[PDB]
Amino acid sequence: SMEQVAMELRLTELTRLLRSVLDQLQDKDPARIFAQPVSLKEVPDYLDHIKHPMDFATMRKRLEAQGYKNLHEFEEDFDLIIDNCMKYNARDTVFYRAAVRLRDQGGVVLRQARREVDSIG
């Protein structure tokens, strides 16, 4: 149907916008702390602590398969990155502090993404 195509175009355009958002957020992580999944070879107990691991590479895979239907889903995954790190790591660590800085900087980006998603439809 043409209605199905139109819905597919909207998903494609959301994907474009989420790719730009993802780039901007990942620039706020210049140490690349959140770039890849926590390795279970290097942190063998991780999944005893963190039930839903997340990282920027994993989000990029989901994005490129057009797997985010709305901004809320994307933000959920971004918040997992931050929130998982702030639980596993203590306050005095470079990991925790990186997460705080990513959250604070990323909020600015997400605030305008939400306006754009709503505005363009």
Coordinates of C-alpha atoms in Angstrom, one line a residue, residues 22 25 34 52-63 67-68 70-84 102 110:
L22 CA 23.7 9.6 17.9
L25 CA 26.0 12.3 21.7
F34 CA 30.9 4.0 26.0
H52 CA 20.4 -4.8 30.2
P53 CA 23.9 -3.8 28.9
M54 CA 24.1 -1.0 26.3
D55 CA 26.8 0.9 24.4
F56 CA 27.0 3.2 21.3
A57 CA 28.0 0.4 18.9
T58 CA 25.0 -1.7 19.9
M59 CA 22.7 1.4 19.4
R60 CA 24.3 2.0 16.0
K61 CA 23.4 -1.6 14.9
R62 CA 19.8 -1.1 16.0
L63 CA 19.6 2.3 14.3
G67 CA 15.0 -0.5 14.9
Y68 CA 14.0 2.7 16.8
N70 CA 10.3 6.7 18.0
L71 CA 12.7 9.0 20.0
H72 CA 11.5 7.5 23.3
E73 CA 13.0 4.1 22.4
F74 CA 16.3 5.7 21.4
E75 CA 16.5 7.7 24.6
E76 CA 15.8 4.6 26.6
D77 CA 18.9 3.0 25.2
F78 CA 21.0 6.1 25.8
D79 CA 19.8 6.3 29.4
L80 CA 20.9 2.6 29.8
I81 CA 24.4 3.5 28.8
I82 CA 24.6 6.2 31.5
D83 CA 22.5 4.5 34.2
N84 CA 24.3 1.1 33.9
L102 CA 27.7 12.5 28.9
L110 CA 18.1 15.5 23.3

